Amino acid sequence: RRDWENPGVTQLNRLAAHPPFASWRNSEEARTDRPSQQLRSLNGEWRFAWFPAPEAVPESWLECDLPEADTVVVPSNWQMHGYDAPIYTNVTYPITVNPPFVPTENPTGCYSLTFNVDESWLQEGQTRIIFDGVNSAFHLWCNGRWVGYGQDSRLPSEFDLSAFLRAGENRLAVMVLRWSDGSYLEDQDMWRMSGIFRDVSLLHKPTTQISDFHVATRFNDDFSRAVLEAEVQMCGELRDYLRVTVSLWQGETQVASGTAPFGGEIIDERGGYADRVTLRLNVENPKLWSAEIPNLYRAVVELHTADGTLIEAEACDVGFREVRIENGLLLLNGKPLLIRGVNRHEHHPLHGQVMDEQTMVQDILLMKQNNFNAVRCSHYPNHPLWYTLCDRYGLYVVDEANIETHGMVPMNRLTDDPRWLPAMSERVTRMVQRDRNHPSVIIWSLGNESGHGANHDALYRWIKSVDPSRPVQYEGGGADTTATDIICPMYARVDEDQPFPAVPKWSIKKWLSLPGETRPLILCEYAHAMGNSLGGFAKYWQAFRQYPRLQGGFVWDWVDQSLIKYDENGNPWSAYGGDFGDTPNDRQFCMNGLVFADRTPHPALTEAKHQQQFFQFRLSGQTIEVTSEYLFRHSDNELLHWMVALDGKPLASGEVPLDVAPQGKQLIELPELPQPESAGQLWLTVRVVQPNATAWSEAGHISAWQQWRLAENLSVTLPAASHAIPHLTTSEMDFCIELGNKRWQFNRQSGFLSQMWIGDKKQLLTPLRDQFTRAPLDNDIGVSEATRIDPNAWVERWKAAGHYQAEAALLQCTADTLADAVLITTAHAWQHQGKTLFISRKTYRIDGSGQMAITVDVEVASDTPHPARIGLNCQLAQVAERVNWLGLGPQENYPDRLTAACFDRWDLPLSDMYTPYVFPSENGLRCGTRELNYGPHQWRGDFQFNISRYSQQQLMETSHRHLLHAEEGTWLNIDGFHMGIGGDDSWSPSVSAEFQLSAGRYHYQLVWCQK
Amino acid sequence: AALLQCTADTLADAVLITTAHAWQHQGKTLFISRKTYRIDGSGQMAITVDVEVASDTPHPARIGLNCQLAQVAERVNWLGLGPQENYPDRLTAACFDRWDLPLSDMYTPYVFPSENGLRCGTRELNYGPHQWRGDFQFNISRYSQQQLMETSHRHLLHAEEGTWLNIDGFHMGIGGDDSWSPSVSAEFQLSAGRYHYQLVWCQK
Ligand SMILES: *[C@H]1O[C@H](CO)[C@H](O)[C@H](O)[C@H]1F
Ligand SMILES: [Mg+2]
Ligand SMILES: [Mg+2]
Ligand code: NA
Ligand code: NA
Ligand code: NA
Ligand code: NA
């Protein structure tokens, strides 16, 4: 049969899909969500063996353990145990495209388990096994006998073992195929793995049972009244004495309850459903569910006899909430949402695609503390617990069918084929069927990157029909097809159009008002967080805030998909595409997260947190206007703290309780602020603090901030004439300057400050030279390989123009003496193949104070690609423990990623000055610095800088962080100007014009000295 | 203007004058100007200017220099945007090239008088035997900003002795989305706080 190469066959003997069951036999257990005895885990220690193909499987296997098998933990991904390689491919299918066939060499994993079944279970009722996630397809046997088959790796496959079990010891044989025709619908850009990766369990149901239940909450115009409607379906023998009781609880308080025997209303000419019943519960002033206040009720569904005897109980958490699109806006409980979302894969650097509750919880808490309110299940139904936690902590969820056919040509090749409708249908239907009772799910998604075909229209229609409670969205085929209630593009830019044929990506602001367009717009993917990215994040936030119809989006993505590997030494390292021998592969493309695989944030996370803030401020004079973007809660666990500093010197602070209603304003008058004895800029900083701990944060959690410049008093004070004057020692090869214990040397061949001495210690390992390039960010690179270039990538443009290859050609080097200083003047040209790219004119003024003032003026040829930077660099001989500076911080920040940073005086261990992106590049810059202190050195001006033990060249030359080696001394990169980092996407130039170094002429001035 | 410093140095091939001034109002330092004048054996005077603008003072209208030339010449020739009046937020129409007009075309006779005649993106300006080089904006006429500012009807203007030259490293947008509320877009406001420019003044 080769059922795995036939889309017409997606399962054999599978039971119908339904919401989470537990078959309690005690209503209070049910009520309380206590553990149910009728439901048990088979997770743990299994027997497993790997074969290169199903045809290599021995018959005996059904019969008895293979001696050679190994004891492994289940659930797991076999690649995570070393049986074969996990493969990292983005678009290109990991197998030959030739549906519905797969390779003859089709890695097969033979799992088996010997376990005990109790007689009680077999005397009566029904016993089924549930495999939450089996990737990609599998055949099942019990005690030697064949039970069934099943496809779709991301939804539960269930089978009736009732007739297969013996009391005592029993044997399960599970033949899992890596590749099946299902794989053609599983082309997500992530690691390609396989096995029994989700729970395995046994559920006992009575013969007469609750086979399905649907919960609906409808409301009146002002939400003061609601009706909970619950449709209940049974299986088993219908009897007049059978009944259903549905009850609702607000905690320990029974809110409502209703009983009725079976038998639905007339549906049509043949009658109604004798085996179903609907209960309707009225609720006055229900407590509404939202991400803001995840108010939940408990619903208990009891199947019993008229005399009070309980057959079984099922139940679920209930959130009263209404989701609907009206007059072009996405409304929740009548209020238009603002989606602060993130896409999230189920990824563990260790466990692979196997998810655990702790990681889930950790993810949710990180999201929430980062001002995230929504998440998209990119790109398939998640492990069942996910929804529960979302229901509980409060996160809006986009539930997505497990359908992605990215690598077909064109993309809709299958989705437009009616012969694929069936397999596709199951992936949609079974999801709705399973998750339709979770309040957290607010939108259904048809899948991802599978073009736009008729199959999508049909399914779009199916959902609308069966679950009018939620909007359906789908980005394929253009983001605004007839199969979507939401314009939900990926990577559409704020102001910039990308008019690709057939599927253009217009500026979001523009998209909304195209002739006849009326839908709301929420990006299904945006601000591609790969490596040093998120440049331009603020531009989106501003726009979302300004246009009602721009209702946010889901950033791409939450966590880097790196996997842990170890070196000889046994030490762990983060791996990516191709690191497992996988090929073809997409290398680092699998790392686009806001946090590293271990959940350590990337610096971009903070930029995301600020921009997603729920309080907005405005300052007028001494008056602060706080505005709340909350729709539902008041600011009841918040205080505003503020503080005034002069140049980092704290001059005054205070707190102020916040008392703003959802969407209201609060003014805060700052008390007269004293006068600073002293030149400089006064800076106001305000943070919103949570005094009390929550379910998602601890007391003192900071949820928002903002800063402003208050008055400024320019300095009009004269240095103060210095006692001594520096001495100029000319020479054939060098201009030397001495001043006390200090010496500066300028190599006349080169035109650069070759060395400096304090006392008898040399200061530099490498001369101080201009720098116009940077170790390329993932955004600079784009898809620019070896096999294939991509001309347009910044990195390509730079390479090609000679940027990395240009060497300095002296044009002038002189020295003069002034009344109180020596003046070194230089001019250099940077050429490539006869083109002068840049010209650097400088002056060094060393005075009686021993301060060297450097003035730089660079000219950039207009027809050369705008440089990554305009600064200087050198290798210092020293290695200090800390870095202290007066500027933007404390975290890494770039020009188009600097809103979250604050201007103040920061001090960190040098290590905190380097950012450990798994794929190395220019990192750790800090902008708007007026003063930098390191070792004996002090630099002052208004520049950007980074400082670490790794040079630009090393960075650019090393593919993996674990391979970096601290160099001798410390590398300092100090820039007058630094180019934006971009990120609207990572595969095309995304650095906005205002952040490009196009001026042609730049001036900067630095003062170097010893403190 | 409050002089903070003024000095003279002798170079290999030149004399260097270094100055610094503080502009204040009611005890407030509004702006700081720091310069060097470098005259070499070639007769070229190179002016380098660095200014600081208090962050809490309103963004200034322009950052430049000005002076009344003794001389009155018939034409003005320049290498930059033109030939007509052009401002920062109103210069797309203008073209960069070599322009040469009668002095008078360098003045815009708006009925209600104001700053006018500016030309941006100039690399070279020649008037009489004078010549200025760099990268700036300038205006030149027989009318001071003060006159312009005190006279409300163009007919009431009177040519002053000599020619007033306004050379700017920087000039604020003129606006106009409306004429009754501030309309200069932020990108056209002189809010950077620190400004630098340099010009070469010489003869020919
Ligand atoms: C949106 O694009 C990103 C690119 O890293 C991923 O491929 C997503 O799965 C896709 F839907
Ligand atoms: Mg099949
Ligand atoms: Mg894809
Ligand atoms: Na909006
Ligand atoms: Na990716
Ligand atoms: Na690199
Ligand atoms: Na006037």
UniProtKB/Swiss-Prot annotation, chain B:
Q: Which family does it belong to?
A: Belongs to the glycosyl hydrolase 2 family.
Q: What induces it?
A: By allolactose.
- Could you tell me the gene encoding this protein? lacZ
Assembly: Homotetramer.
**Annotated positions binding substrate:** 180
**Tree of life domain:** Bacteria
Q: Where is this site: Important for ensuring that an appropriate proportion of lactose is converted to allolactose?
A: 180
This one is known as Beta-galactosidase
User: What is the source species?
Assistant: Escherichia coli (strain K12)
